[PDB]
From a paper:
The [name] endoribonuclease enzyme, known as [name], is highly conserved and plays a critical role in the ability of the virus to evade the immune system. [name] is a three-domain 34 kDa protein that was demonstrated to form a barrel-shaped hexamer in solution by the assembly of two trimers. The oligomerization is mostly driven by the contacts of the N-terminal (ND) and the middle (MD) domains, while the C-terminal domain (CD) carries the canonical catalytic residues from the endonuclease family. In terms of substrate specificity, [name] of the coronaviruses is described to cleave a great variety of single- and double-stranded RNAs in an Mn2+-dependent reaction, by hydrolyzing the 3′ end of pyrimidines, with a strong preference for uracil, and to release 2′,3′-cyclic phosphate and 5′-hydroxyl ends as products.
During our cryo-EM studies, we were able to elucidate multiple high-quality models of NendoUhex in different pHs and buffers, with resolution ranging from 2.5 to 3.5 Å. Based on our biochemical results, we performed cryo-EM data collection of NendoUhex in buffers where the enzyme showed maximum activity and reduced activity, such as PBS at pH 6.0, Bis-Tris at pH 6.0 (two more active conditions) and HEPES at pH 7.5 (a less active condition), detailed in Supplementary Table S1. For more basic buffers, such as MOPS pH 7.0, HEPES pH 7.5 and Tris pH 8.5, the enzyme activity of both NendoUmon and NendoUhex was virtually negligible. Despite their similarities, models showed consistent differences in the switch region. For samples in HEPES at pH 7.5, we observed that the canonical form of interacting switch regions assumes a more closed and mobile conformation in comparison with known crystal structures. The overall structure of the hexamer is also deeply affected by these distinct conformations of the switch region, where in pH 7.5 we observe a more contracted form of the barrel. In fact, this open–closed form model seems to agree with our biochemical data showing that the enzyme is far more active in acidic than in basic pH, where the switch seems to be found in the closed conformation. A general observation we made was that particles from samples in basic pHs, such as HEPES at pH 7.5, tend to be individual particles, while particles from samples obtained in more acid pHs, such as Bis-Tris at pH 6.0 and PBS at pH 6.0, tend to be arranged side by side, forming filaments, which is a common mechanism of allosteric control of enzyme activity.
Residue numbers in the entry:
A (entry chain E), B (entry chain D), C (entry chain F), D (entry chain B), E (entry chain C): -1 to 345
The structure:
Amino acid sequence: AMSLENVAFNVVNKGHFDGQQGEVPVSIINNTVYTKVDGVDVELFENKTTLPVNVAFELWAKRNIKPVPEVKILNNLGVDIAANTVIWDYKRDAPAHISTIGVCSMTDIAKKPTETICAPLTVFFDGRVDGQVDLFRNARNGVLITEGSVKGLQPSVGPKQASLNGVTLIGEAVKTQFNYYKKVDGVVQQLPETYFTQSRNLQEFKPRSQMEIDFLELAMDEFIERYKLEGYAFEHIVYGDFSHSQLGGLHLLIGLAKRFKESPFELEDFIPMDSTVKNYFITDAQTGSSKCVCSVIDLLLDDFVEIIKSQDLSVVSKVVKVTIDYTEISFMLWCKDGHVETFYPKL
Amino acid sequence: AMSLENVAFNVVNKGHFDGQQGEVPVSIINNTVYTKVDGVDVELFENKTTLPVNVAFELWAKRNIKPVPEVKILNNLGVDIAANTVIWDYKRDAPAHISTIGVCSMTDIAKKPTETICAPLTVFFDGRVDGQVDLFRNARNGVLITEGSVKGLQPSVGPKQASLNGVTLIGEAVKTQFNYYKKVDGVVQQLPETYFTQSRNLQEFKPRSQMEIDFLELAMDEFIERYKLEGYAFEHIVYGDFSHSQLGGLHLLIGLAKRFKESPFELEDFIPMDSTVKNYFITDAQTGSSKCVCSVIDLLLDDFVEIIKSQDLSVVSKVVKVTIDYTEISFMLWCKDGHVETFYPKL
Amino acid sequence: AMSLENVAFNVVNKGHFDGQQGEVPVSIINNTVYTKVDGVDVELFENKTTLPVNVAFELWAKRNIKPVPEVKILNNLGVDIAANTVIWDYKRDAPAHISTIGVCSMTDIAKKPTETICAPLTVFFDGRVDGQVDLFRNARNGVLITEGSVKGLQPSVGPKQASLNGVTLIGEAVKTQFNYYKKVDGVVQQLPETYFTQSRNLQEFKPRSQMEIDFLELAMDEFIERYKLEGYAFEHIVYGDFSHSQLGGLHLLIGLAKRFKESPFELEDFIPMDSTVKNYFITDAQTGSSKCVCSVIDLLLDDFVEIIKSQDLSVVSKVVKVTIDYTEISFMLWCKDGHVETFYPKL
Amino acid sequence: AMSLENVAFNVVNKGHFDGQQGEVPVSIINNTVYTKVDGVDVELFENKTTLPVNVAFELWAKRNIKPVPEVKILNNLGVDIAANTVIWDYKRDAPAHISTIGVCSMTDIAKKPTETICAPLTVFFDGRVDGQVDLFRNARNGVLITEGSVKGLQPSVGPKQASLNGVTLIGEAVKTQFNYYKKVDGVVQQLPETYFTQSRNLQEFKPRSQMEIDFLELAMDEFIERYKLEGYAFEHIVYGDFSHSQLGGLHLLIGLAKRFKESPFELEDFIPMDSTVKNYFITDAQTGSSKCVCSVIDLLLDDFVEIIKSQDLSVVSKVVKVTIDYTEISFMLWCKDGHVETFYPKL
Amino acid sequence: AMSLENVAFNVVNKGHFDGQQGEVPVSIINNTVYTKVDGVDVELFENKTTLPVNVAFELWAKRNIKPVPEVKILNNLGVDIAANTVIWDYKRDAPAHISTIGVCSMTDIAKKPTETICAPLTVFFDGRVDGQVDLFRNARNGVLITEGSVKGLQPSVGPKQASLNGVTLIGEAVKTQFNYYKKVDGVVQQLPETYFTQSRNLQEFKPRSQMEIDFLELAMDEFIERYKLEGYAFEHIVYGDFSHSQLGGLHLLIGLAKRFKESPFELEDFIPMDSTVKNYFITDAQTGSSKCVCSVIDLLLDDFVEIIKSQDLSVVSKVVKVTIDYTEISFMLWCKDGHVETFYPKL
């Protein structure tokens, strides 16, 4: 059975819900779950969601603690429901998919896991758990991650990193590299050859390739010179221009770190969630420059150079379709006179 | 085990917690417990207390549905805790005794029912349940009600009336009259001879003796002279005087009903609870007479006459103490020239 | 467009949302919508639902004010969604169907009005509005009510009464009699010859047939004798027995009125909603009799007699399926020695 | 000094704040003030306003309990602030004027009394309290009510009834008849000869003149014939027409009672407050007739006849200025062919 | 007297409640106390407790600002209530002991400071305040801290550090070293010779002895061999092993700092409170290693070596009771073949 006091017991001892037996007093006051440890109330959980507090507490305590794909990957892959587990979105601080089936009943609106309302539901399956590959096979539209490989199916190599307990990481002790399978209309797919966001951030930016180490360390103009990037105008699209109140270009996280190292400033995430492209409210604390909305995307700088290389320069103002995180991101690219005038993900 | 969804199950089927097994979805939103009946949320409970909503829901669903003594009887008898049941104060919409032991743990603050902090608590025992008489025997300070009689103990006859599911009543189908036992320091106290409030209501006042029928029907002065109450000032202490803005008298519910028959007015209960003497805020709609506070007692008119008779009138400004509902209520009785100037429950 | 201030404007002038233009200040504080009429906040709406307050306010202001089928009829007919209007459930004090499509986009979970997610949605169509018959024709599974009659479809006569603004009534000035059509899997249905609840209550019970007037007025035993009901034991199944704490029989609203007239008591609806059978918590204020759960059903007493007449008495303990309000209600009917021992809707 | 525990003390003993000394424990939980009477929390106050709960509790406990003018009178007279007391609006269940000066510093926004920000406020003065006449004299824009009469000022006779503790009444023991004075720009006014709403309701409608008693008792057509007002068409403007879904006319409370006496129906006040004209959502439970908005006004039927008598019939569709409750109410009157086609307060 | 506005005054000027005179406007909105500084509301306090907001505000403003023992010390010493002061638990953001006697009356469940209900309460006395030593003498069960020394009583040296305004510290300017006294059942105790937690953390770990500086600076293996720790397996019980997803050993804060210096990771305190042993949810951001629950204890590394030295190695799987912070903490210690297989505080 599922009870609030048992869930609170598990949380108090383990921090998540295993399924032990034992119960503890629980108090609920205004979107908050307290328990009386040693005669004093301590806050176990605080509902930041739009769900009822007991519902969200029971979803949170049941969250997945093994490494899992980042929620942006599942959004791009169209996942709607997770089978037999809960994916917690530590950005939103709430479950990734509002309904849950194969986990608990009153979270979902679908009648049955394969009912008519629940047919176009793209499920998610965790190969590391037994039987999930089978459930994939018998599924209508589903996405499967597997720790290793499965028979009779072409794999698809995903990102190096995964989210473990809300921190993204590349794991030695843990395999944060899964193989992906997709079956829409019961028919396996051919996942596109795609590009993976590195999922980094300014205050802890770490270069992951020699080009990145050169970018961070080398001076500006001699870096453009050194990697033969003179014709592609990285002084704006990457390096970031501050000569005006309206901050210009600067649509790569690498450039943001390369400037933030000089003088810190702030990023204002007005839509707290996860996506391949992230719109920030950017303000330069040194010069006073600020852009109302700035679309930042975080490729490998190696991969940024590769995609810019593979692109012809003939079209004056072209739109490119590049496959990032299994989704087609469209890049606006005005090329003037055979050089890169502007290049960023179109709003 | 103790489960919120089990409690809601019982409430949905039975309206109270029996102890069946089954669960129903539960949602908590802002001091309110809902459940999904046939796909729609219906509100099971709404917390009017100062307790956490799940705590109060569990206490409410565990309330006693057999006839029970009115809470004023238990307050006067000093009861502090009930054993193995919950008394619901439908006046306050909250349990009668905030702590609860012998039922559940985290409600009470005493460590153990026998522990030192819990020794000086007057417990309440329900004879109709088995074993409770024994528990009363082995109890330090306790009050016991029995439907019939117990061996080796002098009974004490209480009111004919009782609270069944929050409505007070006299029952032939159900025995609403109990025998009372009180033990202080394990020593069986002898209960005083006492008078009982009739717990009647203003809107639905019903005479319970011939004198009351005469009061309601007979004219005023013909009534005072008819029962020979001319020297006892019933025209003020009972009938109530409306000549002035400051309302006078009206300290018996009988007189309030006698006026309310002639014209409705409003009684405002600024302290919603249950007591032997109840202070009301009176506004007379016809005359406009109003008194900020007026103490009302609903003792039997027969027994009111009896107490007024048994009392000498020599003392000008005496204070009587009569035992009502097992507690000493003191009236102020100012007598002038062998008759009663004023007489009411002193504030 | 839809805005909170426009909706509040409409509510302030009309009481519901027509679609006028004009806006008024709005304040939201804790599940409550206020507006500043002449410099003072007046409460426009108070959210009793589990929906966000602005969502529920906009649903309520958009509710249907023409006469509509009672929500129990729509539940029985399986309706899941209403097209182009909102049905307010004044019992629950919340919308009858949580999602809305054909009305508003951010209340439903189905992607489109026509989608695989919304294939099994039994929609509701209001023939009194233009185009709704056509939408019914093109619909997958739908229920249509029509003011008069439609071509090519067998009608189905529904109840005499409808719900107008939350009060149920039979209308002279308004036609509260609709014809019903059901198309599951695209194919028209054959709505069963059914029995209709009269939707009455104790506070204002009014007889609707001569047998009912005899029941209310005539004495008990000579009424059983007069309509030749001696062999069917209406003293229990209808009249209601109070000889014990556990109240017996008494499963018809008419018997409830026939007793409540003698001495009033209370009914506790612990599941506030609408259904053909309603479980009450019943307590006899005179005798002190009380049943924890009592299933009450309100047929026409004429129709009760007819259904009991149609039943053979051979089966000792039979279960009868009778079609009430387009749904199969099953009575348990214990017949001993050719007479009606017990007969009530089985729990 | 003003403290929450002192205020709660006064409320617990008196029901309002006198200014005694003594304090009681107070708890605040979610717009509610509780106090611990004899070990149990009892709810003292529940905030229905948009003010902070302690602010509103301290305003409520300081409300005026002497008879006071109805809030609609003060609105019409333009009162913005009350000096040295609080007017509670029991309709809205909140103070009549949000700010208070001369009472409490942290409720108003004007810096000081008679300040430049405070100059254009019409204050209210209670003659029954000492010094208020003087404060009126020295005031810029003020309205004074006096129990009796004042020297050097023409009085103005107000309504017979006043609001005492939220119930309107004509008082014998209390003088609910005040004389009014208005001084705009420090210049005394000439209050118009006006007509007064009687402030009645359907549940307890009581005729106040012989014509009203005839209206209630007499049949319709012979009542029109009897008082000989056949040309003025009271079958619509007063009696109310019920032959259509859209209810017709029926803009006088007297007519509403004359129907509600026959068969009860429901009034839905969608703007809970006080005004000379009140817009109701009206529905006929018998016929099924219903009007979305109905402006009801409650004169003395004597005075209705008087205003209709003083009316010329030449203008086909005229707008009439009539002084009711010291404010100009406009009646629209389609009077075609010398007869009263339609006549009601224009929306 | 105690009032909300006076308390807010003190807080606004001083930050805590001294007892000055003066009052300031206060607003309460949803577990938050605001005051109007210069015409704008500023938030004074925000209720994180389970107490009523005014109750908690008055407790917080009355908190102790002199250095005080860590709440874990008082928990271990069994303290139930403080006398004449409030200990604030800055971990929980709530008072350390729910009930207060000598502070205010509506905080304690005990009827009196000295009563049968409050006999078994271990009170806390602050010797730095006058009369508290005397109150200790006359006390039933009490714990006293003294700044210096008292006559006729054996002292007991406590920890070097105290909590001043929620930050723990060893004080030069302030004496954070008290002498402890315990009188259970009126008889002075013999406080055990015990070990004291150092109360440090990863973000600001600072070594406090030469052995600790060697630990932080020296690499692993030469540190084990250098302090003769080869046979005691500090590579697991202290250094922490990351070869697997399930992190191993690592039950000393010093080892946590010694690793966190290399690569940072996170600690999730799922039970926010204070205790001698603290269960963390630990995840290695570099290797991906993570343990669901990890009991961390923070001795002086010198004292850890001392306890491991004093312990025999004969028992294969022993449990050691060592007195830390005046309480008996038991380590599980699996010794295999004369070496320390595992050693950590048993869960």
